[PDB]
């Protein structure tokens, strides 16, 4: 059974320009466990990214949290890029301070 | 704390 | 409130790229407390919460011994399962196991569970009576018989009703400052204009623990599910959780709508209005 990942991109704390925060990309509801997740700053891959230990829900589907320390500005674009077997091409979800 | 059952017993 | 202890185990075969990778994690409620990664540096069970560090060397050695033995059984299982289902040695396959126990507000046993999956679907599961097995398909019947013969359910029952409950209570006590706390959500509402004709109201709940929460919309005191969006509860990364609920409303009718928030940390439910 294969299941496609759900994706949420968000900050740990309410965003304030110029103040350090954490950028999160939560991937969940996927099967198999093989997945690629990158955080992007203005289209470029952020190098220093950590993640949670692989775990799963009642329905056996996997979840992971990917995260990096960052300082948001008015004029910087952040996104999460995800690839999985179920996806024809990588899926890019942009960060929205209000979501 | 994990279960202390002989793991070879619970092989499929 | 109620509490739980759960262990989750995952093994993945990758033929042509070495032997299987194994990951094990342990939770009390929504807090991870231990981990093991077969490819990691330590080759031991590792702490992930400050209170588990109160455990001595005998614990760490015993937990390490048991988790490594679990990785080895999964390696054997992966081969056994390919035979059962007549599969070739070329594909990647996944084995998963979960077990643990729930207790009530009195920290007394509510129920236990032990279940196994193969390639993303149910394989075999212990029933709520902790005496009998549910085999998902014909192949799993072979496993049911072996586990009946080896008296696995009896042994699991003793663990789930005794050891599991007792160690859960010990952890809740040892880690009282964090595990027994209730952080009430910090709540607010935003307003976004889609156009001249409609607006989106978003009800936020932030910095809460435990993860369990209910966000509901009402229009004139009546439950409103149409034209709403509710996101999955998500980890903030600092041990707390986040959630939002939104409703699309006609312009000039914003005041008819209320957001209702229910949470263990709240003595009475909150009502928010724009
Ligand atoms: Na034990």
Residue numbers in the entry:
A (entry chain B): 1 to 99
B (entry chain C): 1 to 12
C (entry chain A): 1 to 274
Article sentences:
For phosphopeptides with this canonical motif (hereafter referred to as canonical phosphopeptides), the phosphate moiety could act as a “phosphate surface anchor”, mediating extensive contacts to HLA-A2. To address this, we determined HLA-A2 complex structures of three canonical phosphopeptide antigens (RQApSlSISV, termed PKD2 and derived from Protein Kinase D2; RQApSIELPSMAV, termed RQA_V and derived from Lymphocyte Specific Protein 1 (LSP-1); RQIpSQDVKL, termed RQI and derived from adenosine monophosphate deaminase 2 (AMPD2)) in both phosphorylated and non-phosphorylated states.
We also examined the structure of RQA_V, a 12-residue phosphopeptide, in both phosphorylated and non-phosphorylated forms. Although RQA_V possesses the canonical motif and incorporates a subdominant anchor residue at position 2, surprisingly pMHC affinity analyses showed similar binding affinities for modified and unmodified versions (Kd 60 nM and 26 nM respectively). In fact, the additional two residues were accommodated via a novel helical segment towards the C terminus of the phosphopeptide (left). Comparison of unmodified and modified structures showed the RQA_V epitope undergoes a dramatic change in conformation upon phosphorylation, greater than for PKD2, reflected in the higher peptide rmsd value (RQA_Vnp versus RQA_Vp) of 2.1Å. In RQA_Vnp, S4 adopts a low conformation in the binding groove forming no interactions with surrounding residues (right), but as for PKD2, phosphorylation results in a raising of the main chain at this position, permitting extensive phosphate-mediated contacts to HLA-A2 (left). As a result, the molecular surface presented for T cell recognition by RQA_Vp (left) and RQA_Vnp (right) epitopes is substantially different.
